[PDB]
Design a protein around this ligand. Sequence first.
Ligand code: TR7
Length: 220
Amino acid sequence: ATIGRISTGSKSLDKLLGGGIETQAITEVFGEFGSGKTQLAHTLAVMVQLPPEEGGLNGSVMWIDTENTFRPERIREIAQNRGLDPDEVLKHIAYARAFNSNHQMLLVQQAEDMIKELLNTDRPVKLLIVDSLTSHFRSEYIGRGALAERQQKLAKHLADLHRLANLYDIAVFVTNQVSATLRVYLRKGKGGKRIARLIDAPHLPEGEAVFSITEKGIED
Ligand SMILES: COC(=O)[C@@H](N)Cc1c[nH]c2ccccc12
């Protein structure tokens, strides 16, 4: 399938990314607390539900939450400020809490069932979020005796995610803190604005985009 793109809500950020986040890819967004990475996650979970002319892919969402950062009220707000129905938007976000790293990996494995179910419907899964990719791994695998297994498990996890992205034409979006992935680093700019920097993209130039966080989520 042709690669599809989901608008981030920000024209600047979309430009940096070549149009938006890609299906058949993992986009990995790094940032410190308050950087905007989870806000971007929330915005994408709304945008993807729009038609292409509006920057979406008429898709459903699956959201794996490792540290209780998903806010249904923020989804409703973003939806409403974008002229959407907050109840319908929330209904098309399948939510799963991951309690630990094993469970997180299991949830990605299990997600394929729902992806298959929705695949040839009016609302196929088009966005799979893992927020965050590494919190459990960092918490559980401490020190050098643990690094080998941590890296192995994480590698397997990323491979499972790539497979779903490629096989089912889904944009995978994961958050992290400091191929395989398209890496974007968020930082604080001036006057409350945020800055995204794209690094080490094989086929997009490095660059920066300045964006805002508003009642619409992310936008210029
Ligand atoms: C196949 O999907 C399901 O059976 C969902 N009822 C539970 C689930 C599994 N993995 C997930 C990932 C994200 C959100 C929900 C889930």
